Amino acid sequence: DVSGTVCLSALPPEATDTLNLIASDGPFPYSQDGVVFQNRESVLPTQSYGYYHEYTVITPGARTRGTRRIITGEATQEDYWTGDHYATFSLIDQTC
């Protein structure tokens, strides 16, 4: 299930950075950025393989990718934030 919507401006600024890189098709800081996200917990709506992709959202100070990601869906303006290492997701609203 998706945990509502969240305005882009209410997320860490690195979320904005990741979306800007997605808009430019990269390049991205981590090699996993852009890999297919399989939605294995069926947390997001069911779609076929390749509908979703995942991108790092950098955590300041972290040596690793940390817990923050954006998952794109193929639909226009369909992007999911998680701040808790894929446990939950919220739809990102870039209009606010």
UniProtKB/Swiss-Prot annotation:
Major location (coarse): secreted
Single GO molecular function: RNA endonuclease activity
Cystines in this chain: 7-96
Coiled coil: none
Compartments (UniProt record): Secreted
Family classification: Belongs to the ribonuclease N1/T1 family.
Gene Ontology CC: extracellular region
Keywords in alphabetical order: Disulfide bond, Endonuclease, Hydrolase, Lyase, Nuclease, Secreted
Gene3D superfamilies for the chain: Microbial ribonucleases (3.10.450.30)
Protein name (record): Guanyl-specific ribonuclease Sa
Active-site residues from the entry: 54 (proton acceptor), 85 (proton donor)
Organism phylogeny: Bacteria, Bacillati, Actinomycetota, Actinomycetes, Kitasatosporales
Reactions this protein catalyses: [RNA] containing guanosine + H2O = an [RNA fragment]-3'-guanosine-3'-phosphate + a 5'-hydroxy-ribonucleotide-3'-[RNA fragment]
Superkingdom: Bacteria
EC number annotated for this UniProt entry: 4.6.1.24
